[PDB]
RNA sequence: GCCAGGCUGUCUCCACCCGAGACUCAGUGAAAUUGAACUCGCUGUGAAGAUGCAGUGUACCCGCGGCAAGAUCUGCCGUGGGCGCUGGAGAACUGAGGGGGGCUGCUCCUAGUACGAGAGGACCGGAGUGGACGCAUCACUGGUGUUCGGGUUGUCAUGCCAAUGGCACUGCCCGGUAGCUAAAUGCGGAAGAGAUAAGUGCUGAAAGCAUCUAAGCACGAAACUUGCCCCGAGAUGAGUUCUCCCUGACCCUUUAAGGGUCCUGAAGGAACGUUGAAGACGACGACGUUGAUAGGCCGGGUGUGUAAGCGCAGCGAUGCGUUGAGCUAACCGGUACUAAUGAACCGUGAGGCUUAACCU
RNA sequence: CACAGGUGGUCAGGUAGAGAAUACCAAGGCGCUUGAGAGAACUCGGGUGAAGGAACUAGGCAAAAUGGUGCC
RNA sequence: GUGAAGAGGGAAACAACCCAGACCGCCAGCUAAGGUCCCAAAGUCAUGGUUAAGUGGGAAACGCGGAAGAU
RNA sequence: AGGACCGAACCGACUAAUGUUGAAAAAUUAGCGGAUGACUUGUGGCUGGGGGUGAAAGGCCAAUCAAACCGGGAGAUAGCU
RNA sequence: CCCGGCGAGGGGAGUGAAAAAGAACCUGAAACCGUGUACGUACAAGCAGUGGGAGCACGCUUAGGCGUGUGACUGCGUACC
């Protein structure tokens, strides 16, 4: 779970470090976004050159919550911090293509079936 | 709130209230006999009855646990002696209350609290 | 159709072959004799009193020992009464079993809410007055394990009512 | 009462061995993949064990690409199949709530050699 | 003067715990205000928002805790004492009426389907899955859990070492029993039904055409109400059903819904105790020896973590086997060992008059 | 008012302490003039806490984090 | 002309609207304004006409329409 | 040696809350400032009311001061309640 | 003399015309506080009264419908300066 202006680390080859949310999305007067929503998350730490620049505002998707998700068996998954991953609106598809850490089994979506591909470490 | 849980008020500082327990305990033990309101008695009673069934075993770790709750050693000394042996056949209820009327000082309830033989 | 009353016991999980955790609620369903039958007829509308539990002859008042004398059978811990489904109607003393419940997979379940004090307006709105103790039905739940020889019935999701406390169990009338 | 825990131990498989917290443990955990299941082997470490009849469940935590992942593994539940212990340590505390800030050496343990 | 960063419930959302008030028991106890009060809502008028004027509706009398729309009063929620439902009493319900919400996104098959030259492209609202509200719960995720355990600095005390207890925010921390908890999980916005606007329609002229209508005469919007739950016979119109109890005597008068005396004291309740996941006080639930209602005890479980002592090693710190040991409040199954005694009080002794059908 | 307020100077121990500050004790003085009750909402003084340290508020105003020695 | 300094009855209430100027008492009769379904005292009285919309029981200019009024 | 710094006692109300009933007719809790300088206080005396005092706010002089209390002029005076 | 606490206060006896004169001491009213007596009130809406008014108790002409104590209901009634 992530609540507006939380920090979330960076699992992706980006360059990213820091980055912090402004916005939340997936549904109307929503509080909190889980692991598998969509959010809105900026940039404080850019690499001297790449395709990320400082200041840019685009999409994300949390791939590891601090607190955690539940399991139909009653197992939960609990991370030692926040982690996301940036996502755009338009290809999907994030330049990043090695992920920091194991992933849950619940990035089975329609549109995260490009990601479980990633991520060797479960 | 208010759903299972022990332990009556008796609104006070927990030290506080501890250091009356020991007191109040010390006092029965010494006196086989007090005379106080009815609400402390009842946890008077609870704290008491523990330290009497413990005593009831004789060794040198169960002295020093009652000493440790108790801070008297001629009282710990007169337990493992007398209480013990003379309560040995029954197991639990070693106090009786007698209501006494209404303390007429603030109205306060109150009762005699003793123990079961109480002499002989 | 017809609803039996019974008994809070506890709540916890089943786990099933596939791996999948379910809460469980779990309440003790003794057979719930019927003692007396109301009819259009005489009482205005079909329905039958049940009785559950036992009391012991002491704390039994005389007009309910001599009610359960007439009805033949020996005094329960209370009444209730289920209005018919315009179905098969039944007989004084017939004993009813959890038996009925094995084929409904969707049940309700009405009980009294937790006592509690006082409450302020934050606290029951988000004006103050009694909390719990208040009649309450939860709807569309639906059963995981019957046990008729152990009288034993477990409901997904939590009802209402602490452990001891009694309940009624109902087909699920939605669906 | 006697109906509850005689459910809750109708449920019970004396299969789990006795593993003390902090006890470097190996788990196997059934995975459903497409229309099939498998196996999967994690290796941790116990933090902390909460043996609530059949509601066990004890913390596992693991170390990978350099970060700390902890999961809650249910003692009786059908997904977990077996617990092995390879690497045995001893530690004077029930919960190693600690560790979470050390690392490298401050984080290791020392053998039992019970 | 400014910038970058770490840093707490200021907040999403607050949750829990420790003390003094808030409530009861025994006593002391003043004020501001006060013409008198048997101190209701709506409509109209009025020196102009009427508790007091005209019309209309509701409301048994009197108390306790707050929400402050105007803490004396009006008003609201919850809960109490008295009273009547007509002999009394204990239970179960029908129900005149009353509380409220009927929200909403994504995907799946339907289906790249009908239709459509092609382009384009559903009705579907059937299934699964989110967001916000309410209700329910602590097994799970954790928070709290100063009443449980362990580490540790200073000081005092137990004649001294060891070992213990108090104080220093719970002295500072690490975990956590039970209860409560959301950040955790179960369910609901029904389906169907009635009346429906627009609209869609069988035959159909007056006015050999035509037309939703003149005659026969059919469906239908997420709009409205039932359907969904909860309170409810103080509904004084005071309801319906079941069961239990009383089956004595005498005297007087102003001779009748009369009065009085001896005996009787039924069922039930209250009175007091154990008390509860019931509670501010009331009230409510289980029990009161014909018993598991509270305490303690046995065993288990949880929690904490290898207690003290013993003998060995290091001339010392300390470790080793005893010892997965000691302790463990609120959890679980038993145990009468202790506390709930025998009792007293109220509540009565066949139930008012008239009418209509029955056997007499 | 036996009120919660002000009233001038002196006597100045031990332990760990740079310290007459800080915490417990020595001799000495006291438990302070309403007590007891289940311990509701709510108010006041505090403690802990998952996603955060400034997204409430005009406002880092309360609270909270560190609080030193020698060197690389 | 009224109130000021005049009561009473009617207009549902109402001080300037209509009748009407209270010496006091009486369980008497007749009238002014206003009524004669009830509330509430009086005709559910008669004759000749309008009304199908509760217009009566709120409304102008204008071609029955105009017409929308106060929890 | 410091209009030197931190920090007791001591002093100031500079700020927030308690109340204008009262515990106080100017007090309480907390924060803040000074804490060898331009400081404070123990005791005694002096500056008297068109006068004293005053870094001027026309501040203070025993419930206040901007003409204090006491007795009198005066049971005053104009309008008005 | 007794109750009461070896008090305060009270109850008897006596003195005292009188103690319905007891040191709180001639005469003793209303506001205020209590008991008893008779009546009304727990389905009933507003300056709380005025006429009608059955009923509920007492004494009267021993009925002859009289007065006193209350006023269920009913028409009217928007305090004083």
Known sequence: ?122 | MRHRKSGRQLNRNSSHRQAMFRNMAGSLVRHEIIKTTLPKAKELRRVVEPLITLAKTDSVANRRLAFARTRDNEIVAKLFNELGPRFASRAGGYTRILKCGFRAGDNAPMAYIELVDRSE | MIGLVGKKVGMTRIFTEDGVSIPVTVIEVEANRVTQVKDLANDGYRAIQVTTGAKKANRVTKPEAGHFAKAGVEAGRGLWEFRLAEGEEFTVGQSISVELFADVKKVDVTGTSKGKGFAGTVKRWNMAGQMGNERVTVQSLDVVRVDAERNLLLVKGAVPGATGSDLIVKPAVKA | ?114
């Open chain 4, 1 to 114: 009462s006697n109906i509850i825990k005689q459910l809750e131990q109708e449920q019970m498989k004396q299969d789990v061995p006795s593993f003390r917290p902090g006890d470097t443990v190996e788990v196997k955990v059934w995975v459903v993949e497409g229309s099939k299941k498998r196996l999967q082997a994690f290796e941790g470490v116990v933090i902390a064990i909460r043996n609530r009849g059949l509601h066990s469940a004890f913390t596992v935590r693991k170390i990978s690409n350099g970060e700390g992942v902890e999961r809650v593994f249910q003692t009786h539940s059908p997904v977990v199949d077996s617990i092995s212990v390879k690497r045995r340590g001893a530690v004077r505390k029930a919960k190693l709530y600690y560790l979470r800030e050390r690392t490298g050496k401050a984080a290791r343990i020392k053998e039992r050699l019970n």
């Open chain 1, 1 to 122: 779970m992530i609540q507006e202006q939380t920090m979330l680390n960076v699992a992706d080859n980006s360059g990213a470090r820091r980055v912090m949310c402004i916005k939340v999305l997936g549904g109307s007067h929503r509080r909190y976004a889980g692991v598998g929503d969509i959010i809105k998350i900026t940039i404080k730490e850019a690499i001297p050159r790449g395709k990320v620049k400082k200041g840019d505002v685009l999409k994300a998707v949390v791939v590891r919550t601090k607190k955690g998700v539940r399991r139909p068996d009653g197992s939960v998954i609990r991370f030692d911090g926040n982690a996301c991953v940036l996502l755009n609106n338009n290809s999907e598809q994030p330049i990043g293509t090695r992920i920091f850490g194991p992933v849950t089994r619940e990035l089975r979506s329609e549109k995260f079936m490009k990601i479980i591909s990633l991520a060797p470490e479960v």
